[PDB]
Amino acid sequence: MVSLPRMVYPQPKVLTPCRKDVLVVTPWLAPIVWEGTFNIDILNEQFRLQNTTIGLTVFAIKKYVAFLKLFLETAEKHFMVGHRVHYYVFTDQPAAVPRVTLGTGRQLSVLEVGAYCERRFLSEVDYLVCVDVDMEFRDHVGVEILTPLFGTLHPSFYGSSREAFTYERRPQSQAYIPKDEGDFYYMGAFFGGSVQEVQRLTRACHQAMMVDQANGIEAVWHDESHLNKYLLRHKPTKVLSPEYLWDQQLLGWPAVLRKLRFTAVP
Ligand SMILES: CCCCCCO[C@@H]1O[C@H](CO)[C@H](O)[C@H](N)[C@H]1O[C@@H]1O[C@@H](C)[C@@H](O)[C@@H](O)[C@@H]1O
Ligand SMILES: O=c1ccn([C@@H]2O[C@H](COP(=O)(O)OP(=O)(O)O)[C@@H](O)[C@H]2O)c(=O)[nH]1
Ligand SMILES: [Hg+2]
Ligand SMILES: [Hg+2]
Ligand SMILES: [Hg+2]
Ligand SMILES: [Mn+2]
Numbered sequence: 352m353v354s355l356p357r358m359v360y361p362q363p364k365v366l367t368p369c370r371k372d373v374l375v376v377t378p379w380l381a382p383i384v385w386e387g388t389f390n391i392d393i394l395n396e397q398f399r400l401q402n403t404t405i406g407l408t409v410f411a412i413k414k415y416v417a418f419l420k421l422f423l424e425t426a427e428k429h430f431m432v433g434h435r436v437h438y439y440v441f442t443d444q445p446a447a448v449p450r451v452t453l454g455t456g457r458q459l460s461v462l463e464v465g466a467y468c469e470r471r472f473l474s475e476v477d478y479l480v481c482v483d484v485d486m487e488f489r490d491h492v493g494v495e496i497l498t499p500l501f502g503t504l505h506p507s508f509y510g511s512s513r514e515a516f517t518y519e520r521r522p523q524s525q526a527y528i529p530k531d532e533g534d535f536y537y538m539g540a541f542f543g544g545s546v547q548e549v550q551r552l553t554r555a556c557h558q559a560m561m562v563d564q565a566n567g568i569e570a571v572w573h574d575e576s577h578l579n580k581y582l583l584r585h586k587p588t589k590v591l592s593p594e595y596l597w598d599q600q601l602l603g604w605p606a607v608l609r610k611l612r613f614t615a616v617p
Contacts, residue, residue: 352361353570356396359520360393364423379454381600384591384614385592385594387582396470398434404437405477406437406480407480408482409439409482410441416444417441418486419440421616427453429490429491431487432458434493434494437460441464454535473547478497478543479549486614489594489613498587499588500543500582500588502534503538504535505538516528516536536579555581592608597612598615
């Protein structure tokens with residue numbers, strides 16, 4: 352909207368790709384986010400000028416409330432630092448949520464679950480990021496991920512053929528995807544986008560899962576199976592590389608990953 356200020360940075364090289372070892376753009380022209388593909392200073396300027404507020408949602412039910420301290424503490428060190436952040440912790444144990452110190456411009460809301468407004472999100476944040484709680488941030492996760500709708504490449508299938516993707520393969524399921532279809536296998540542990548797009552996705556998945564339940568069938572990987580069906584038919588405007596969803600214990604640290612940003616907790 353408003354003009355960017357004068358900035359001094361390395362000139363992009365038209366005849367010199369940033370990354371030659373990986374695909375950095377999808378066939379529908381959506382950027383695939385890898386380290387080396389973005390200048391975070393330019394992106395931070397663009398999003399700060401818009402006074403962008405990012406909502407980060409996590410569910411912590413039962414024993415998972417134990418993952419909240421590390422999750423939040425590391426989010427404070429690596430997630431959208433410099434921007435407005437609103438954490439939404441849905442839990443069945445409100446009093447169990449740890450007292451984590453937050454930086455300025457960041458807030459946390461505890462929402463008790465077991466039953467209990469989506470209009471709230473529309474008036475409080477610009478983007479919604481939905482992640483699993485048994486994780487920790489190890490490096491920068493910033494505005495480079497923000498876009499109308501994004502999905503993240505599952506670390507186990509980024510180099511696999513579509514036939515190997517663990518999509519729901521039964522035609523009787525709404526999440527059905529035949530062997531000759533599919534772009535990528537997205538992991539349900541990290542997705543997001545504008546509030547409107549995220550709500551459209553969740554409403555679509557909720558309805559598809561209800562239809563499956565009525566037909567007596569449960570998708571092989573539940574919610575994730577439906578997420579993949581949705582993103583197949585509604586292409587994400589950005590795709591995050593495995594840098595954003597990794598497990599160093601089970602997968603190590605491949606040369607193709609210059610940074611391990613968000614990882615599973617052992
Ligand atoms: C970074 C995490 C990926 C580790 C590889 C196993 O990933 C499993 O993939 C299937 C689809 O084929 C589902 O997405 C599972 N949810 C994934 O497993 C889950 O994550 C691993 C790390 C374990 O914690 C396992 O118990 C989880 O179900
Ligand atoms: O009793 C439970 C099971 C799951 N979860 C949430 O569901 C997410 C996905 O579940 P899990 O970690 O068991 O899945 P995985 O990544 O192991 O496939 C977790 O990150 C939690 O946020 C929860 O809060 N309570
Ligand atoms: Hg969400
Ligand atoms: Hg869906
Ligand atoms: Hg979904
Ligand atoms: Mn998990």
